[model samples]
Target chain A: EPPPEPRITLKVGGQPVTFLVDTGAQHSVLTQNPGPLSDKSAWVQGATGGKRYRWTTDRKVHLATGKVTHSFLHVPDCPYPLLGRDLLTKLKAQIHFEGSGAQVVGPMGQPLQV
Target chain B: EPPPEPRITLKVGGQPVTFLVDTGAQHSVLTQNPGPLSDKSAWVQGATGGKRYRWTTDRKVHLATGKVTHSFLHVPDCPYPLLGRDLLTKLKAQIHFEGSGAQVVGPMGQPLQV
Candidate 1:
């Protein structure tokens, strides 16, 4: 059966991680810390309030369509690492809603499991 | 089972509507026309590109926590009317990630079904 939400698996720094494709997200955030973090952090404001997250740079993300290098926010205590619009925009991701539930496409117009 | 993408239900002008809780969305949009449309419109840019949507105003949105009146972009041909951050911010919705699934709370700190 089609689930209400969409999630996909991708390689984050040679480690396969399942990411929640969050259309509500402004930037990509990882619940699991990816190696070393820069001395930089930002206040992420949400409906609840603002929270701090450290930035990780030059992280290699592998997707079925292609790969891209970018920064991701590390929120180790959060539940799921989110594939936010920062990467989604860079990747030209397409999110779709249908009777079959939600569907997503990558930069190359390749389908990723939802 | 938990779905990857989070979605919720709300009342739009007394009509019960299911909304995709999109974190990436900068503004709220509606797939179904809520009756009258204003001559005013705006260009909504996404990862793909920009699209035009006419503005609708003073729409009554009823949520589990409370009610609020706001404007929603009318993209009639689009799929699910996304519950964007504009309303989310106003409602102070809290989205949580847990092993059970993604959870959402409304303005009054009331639990909303995910």
Candidate 2:
């Protein structure tokens, strides 16, 4: 059987949101508009398509056992808020997809063993 | 066991070059300078690092049985030429890592079962 999708729970605006980690994405994106933006414009070009996305900086973004808030792009109507390469690299994480679930190892160590 | 790293062989400049398919990478990167000059500039961002890369378009890039050439970003001194999400998504490929080796399914069908 196919392994379950590698999903992670993240806190955006102090609300819990589950996101998929896509190393292929250029920026961290939110599915729904997370409101009260700082009005910055950015262009994201990807395999699927290219679009102009809005971003806000330094929000209280939390990952598993870490409160690492950073800038996030708001892409309207995205299926899921994606944890992209930027954050993954910044966190120095490696993904091992060997078992039934995907494992994510952070900089200090493997904080997420799912 | 952790699967042997998912790898594929591709033809670049009419030569065989093996690459790692990184869903996390923003651009397809070449490890060594493949020669010739396009005098164009592109920037590639990733989890490990970000760098400026050079590109040449419409080159003959082939998978196992497909001759899909694209504009590849050449990052000097890179460890490998990564096949990023862009090409994968464009090709509508899905990767299943449940077994000993990853299975890549393209739009036409499961063209690659390795």
Candidate 3:
């Protein structure tokens, strides 16, 4: 059977950043310099007059498969927070179903087993 | 000397999540079901009565090196959001310095260099 097209709906800083899914990512990421949307606080307003949450960036990333870690710059313009390859290795995903979309079995659904 | 501690301060969902750095990852990630902190909106609340915004989850991610893509899950309990290997690939970070702290570099910052 053909593999799924790769897509997902996940959370970023507690908010949802929706976009085309890419399982190849080692971790999750969001755009930081989101030029226009960066100012669109109305779309994400919380109970008060502003949005709810704080955001920070870490300069480093860990690529388990490559056995390498490198620095990164973040931008917030991304349609959704990206889930990439590094994380895939850590979760060790197992496929339960694959069709229009892929149903993966990983540490996501269950409580951390460690 | 041992590689610097790999640390950085950045943003997420317009908020900040900090943790030990991992340059090996291709993307940035945070933990869902953030157990205790999930409800800790005080740290993230806007100027109103409660937290400042809403949250949802995406189910997929992307990676650069493997030339293959896949799926992912979202968790929120993480002490700090992670910068992983896949994002490192996209950012094409070049290190001009490394030490007690590692400063990072990446693409367009977020305004979409295009």
Candidate 4:
């Protein structure tokens, strides 16, 4: 079954972690501690489909409770910490946000087993 | 059980129907013939959380196969069509993209049984 809502926690370097769940995210992203998570030596396409950049990096990411890693690469064209379906499926969690807390649950709306 | 990957179709005034499943969208939006699908009298916040707009208008939208409606409004500040969790939950669809086609499937990874 699909998880209730997909959400996850973020840990950025020495910064305080935050929780946010976005369904519209094309990919799970995070702001790195001044670096890219992977090697940018790899060619990547920009939003315009015309502009290209050498998005290389070697930053490390620590998912709140999963194996996903955030690349601190520069995506000048992206907005917010997008949690794409790829990561969402991996964690098998759903997000619920209100008040001051954002909670992620499994397919049945229960707290993600993780 | 949660269905499968969720997706939905879109229709613009007179444009050929296009199926786009954007997981990065913060809100399900469409460019309308002249504007918003709902009354613009409604106020909304812009990212970066500043400038406010009188996003007033009257527009209509037709989904590929659901009861949901897309507001023909412009989020001058938004980047691309965002499909937030709210809409995702309602449509109960996941997005799948391959080759040149984008498909919105149910939680079960099957064509929306709509």
As for model 2, its CA RMSD to the true structure in angstroms is 11.2
TM-score of each: 0.51, 0.50, 0.26, 0.49
Task: For residues A39-82, write the lDDT of model 1, one tens digit per residue.
Answer: 99987653323457788876788855577777788876445677
Model with the higher lDDT, candidate 1 or 3 = 1
C-alpha RMSD values across all candidates: 14.7, 11.2, 19.3, 8.1
Residue B22 Cα positional deviation in candidate 4, in Å, after optimal superposition? 4.9
User: Between 2 and 3, whose TM-score is larger?
Assistant: 2
User: Best by lDDT, which number?
Assistant: 1
Arrange candidates, best lDDT first.
1, 2, 4, 3
Q: Of the candidates shown, which would achieve the greatest DockQ relative to the real structure?
A: 4
Tens-digit lDDT string for candidate 1 (B1-114) = 111345687888878777767855667877765667888998775432356778886788885546878788887644567787576666666554433334565545466673
- Ten-residue region with minimum lDDT total, candidate 4 chain A: A41-50
lDDT of 3 by residue, A1-114 (tens): 221223344333333334232332223444554222232122322112323322333322332223223222132433334444434444343222112223333433331232
TM-score on 0 to 1 scale for chain A of candidate 1: 0.80
Which regions of candidate 4 fall more than 4 Å away from where they truly are? A1-7, A12-16, A36-72, A76-79, A95-103, B1-5, B10-26, B31-57, B61-70, B74-114
The runs of at least 3 residues in candidate 3 whose Cα sits more than 4 Å from the true structure, single-residue gaps closed, are A1-114, B1-5, B32-79, B95-97, B107-114
